[PDB]
Amino acid sequence: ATHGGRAVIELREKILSGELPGGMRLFEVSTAELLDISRTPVREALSRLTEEGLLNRLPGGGFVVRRFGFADVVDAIEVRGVMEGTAARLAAERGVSKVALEEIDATVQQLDLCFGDRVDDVDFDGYAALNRIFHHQLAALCGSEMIRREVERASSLPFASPSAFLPDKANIGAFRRSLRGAQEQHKAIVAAIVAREGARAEAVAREHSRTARTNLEYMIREAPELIAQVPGLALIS
Amino acid sequence: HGGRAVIELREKILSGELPGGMRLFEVSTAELLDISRTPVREALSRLTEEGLLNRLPGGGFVVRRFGFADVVDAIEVRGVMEGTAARLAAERGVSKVALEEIDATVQQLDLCFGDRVDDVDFDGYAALNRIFHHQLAALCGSEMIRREVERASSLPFASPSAFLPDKANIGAFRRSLRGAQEQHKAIVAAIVAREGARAEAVAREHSRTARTNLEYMIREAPELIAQVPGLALISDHHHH
Ligand SMILES: [Zn+2]
Ligand SMILES: [Zn+2]
């Protein structure tokens, strides 16, 4: 909607495609010239992408495109899992309003409808979209804006987002099968929160993030053509 | 680090001179600080990245509002992230040189303590505590982990020695540093032993020292709250 927001989209696209490679130094004026836009939205975009974690600030001014390896991707997924586990634990310890529980339980019920009678019968893209909703609701459940922000910050890297490892091209039997266990975890997270069992809520929500890690390991081992389909992984490989 | 504009703007936010909910714009903020536009523009962006300001839709910024429950949540996030750094160092293994670096800090921290329970070099401990926590964030050797721990420690009341300014040198707090120092030793021992679950449990529990001391300030020393630079901006229960 804003010049700044469009600058963020264009700059993110250029970083993800490798047009602005890892290690490239970026400055407000020269980046505005490269994007063919005004200095002001570029200043905002460079700051927002530093908050997002695609860029680092340079000492003395300016920015630098971050470089990422597969070990960085694993660490980013682990941080998301740790923060989602914290949001689940605090919701369990503090208690959640019935309306907020009904909202997330409705998402869980819609997610159950993605599954059929055969093991690989899963509406993959439908699950990926509802999964995004479930994880946003989980981040907000305990009612703390400080917690919600931190969870969303830990989910902001292109490969760290909750459905990053569910791109449409990854709709294969091995990935569909893995969603059954992942959906049982969604149900267990909500049950643990309803039961006020914080240690369980944390353990399951953190373990849930290992589904994306295990699917990344599967891509490397058995389906390397899929690596380029996950946002941010094409340049790494 | 954005020079004097960042320092001046941060100081004004922390003292409550620019209160929570105040809208800030580049040009009018530069006029208020009597500083040129360029460093002020950069400072507003840096302080949004640090988490003290939010960007407004359509341009400009807004000072965030914080209550004591927000401070507790921020300390909890720092503890959770420090626990993650300790767990990953335990699981992955640390080079002997990196362990010797953090162990040297632990030994210097032990030198802060005398034979009487009250005998503690409070300011010396506060300074070396910052080094210990920065070293812990870096121990596993992952730049992703190090950057995230530092980001979770960027709010003024969330930093590892935020509650240890010179003006907070009181009996209950000096006495609390002894148990805190035993936790520093237990974190390192757990990492050396490759016991990740222990490393995480102790490092996360360590952050509850700042939480317990905040609860003590509210209950027994409310005069300290306003004298702790990172707590002056907090809105109390009656006003938040
Ligand atoms: Zn999920
Ligand atoms: Zn400490």
How does this model look, in words?
Chain B: Keywords: DNA-binding, Metal-binding, Transcription, Transcription regulation, Zinc. Chain B: Residues 1-66 form the HTH gntR-type domain. The longest helix of chain A is centred in the middle third of the chain and has 25 residues, at 70-94. In chain A, helix 2 (28-35) crosses helix 3 (39-52). Chain A is mainly alpha-helical and 237 residues long. The two termini of chain A are 33 Å apart. Chain A has helices at residues 3-16, 28-35, 39-52, 70-94, 98-112, 124-140, 145-153, 173-194, 198-222, 233-236, and strands at residues 25-26, 55-57, 63-65. Chain A has two domains: 3-65, Winged helix-like DNA-binding domain superfamily/Winged helix DNA-binding domain (Arc Repressor Mutant, subunit A); 70-229, Up-down Bundle (Four Helix Bundle (Hemerythrin (Met), subunit A)). Chain A has a three-stranded antiparallel sheet with strand order 1-3-2. Chain A has ten helices and three strands; from the N terminus they run H-E-H-H-E-E-H-H-H-H-H-H-H. Helices cover 65% and strands 3% of the residues of chain A. The interface between A and B is medium-sized, with 31 and 30 residues. The complex binds zinc ion (2 copies).
